Each structure stands twice: as C-alpha cells, then as structure tokens.
Design a protein around this nucleic acid. Sequence first.
DNA 1: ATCTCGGCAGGAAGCAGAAGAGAGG
Length: 121
Amino acid sequence: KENKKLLCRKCKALACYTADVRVIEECHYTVLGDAFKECFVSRPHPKPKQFSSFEKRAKIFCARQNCSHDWGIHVKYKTFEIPVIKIESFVVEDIATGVQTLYSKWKDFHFEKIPFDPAEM
DNA sequence: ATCTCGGCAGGAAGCAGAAGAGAGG
Ligand SMILES: [Zn+2]
C-alpha cells in the first residue's frame, strides 16, 4: 500500500489515513468517515464568512485537551458540513518504517488525490 | 513596460522567494 498515516504535528495522535482524504476544487482537502470526528473538536469560527462554495462555521482542533492544535476549519459545502484540513497541521508517517515527513504545501505531498464525491456520504 | 515588496513581519499560502474583485507609497 502507498496508504499513509496523518498524525497531529504537535502530539503525533493518529488523525486519518490518506485513503480517507478527498480533494474539493483542486486545492481544499477533507476527510471521510465517522472515525475522523473522534479525532477533532470544533470551536465557533470567530469570523464566520463565505468564500467560494464554502460557509465557515467552525475551526477544528486536535481532540486531545493537552494538545488542542489547530487542524483547519468546518464548512457548509452544498448540503454537507465537512472538515477542511491544513497540511501544516500534520506529519505524514510511512506505516512500514514509521518515518515522518513535514509538508507546508499539498502540491509537495505526492499521494493518490481522489476528488470528493457526494455519493460517498 | 517591467519590477517591486526573515520565523511572524503597508491599509490556496514555512536561502531566497486562494479570496467588499498593485502603484509608484
Ligand atoms: Zn494533537
């Protein structure tokens, strides 16, 4: 498998696998499934606002109370409410070796980037 | 008709550079 783990960059908690990640409109990344909702907590967005196809409701954070690292935002997209994750918020871990890589640009991070399909909901 | 602008710093996004829709500062 080319499947990789994303860990919290601050505490190294498991956030999700690249197999769960989907791309919206070429440059915003979300995570599928109910597992990911156990990994983050929301706070209301201090400056909630529309941009492009998104209405920002919340910021999301590592669910660990001693960590609380910023992970991205929670948005309304179409009829859905979805997380949008920052690449800077995570380290990418090779599952076989446990070696960790830091990215600040999604374009530097080479993995199978599957477009978001509403039918997967 | 270009070029310009060090770890947070003029009104999408980490050694040299996406979103109320550039100006000579
Ligand atoms: Zn964390």
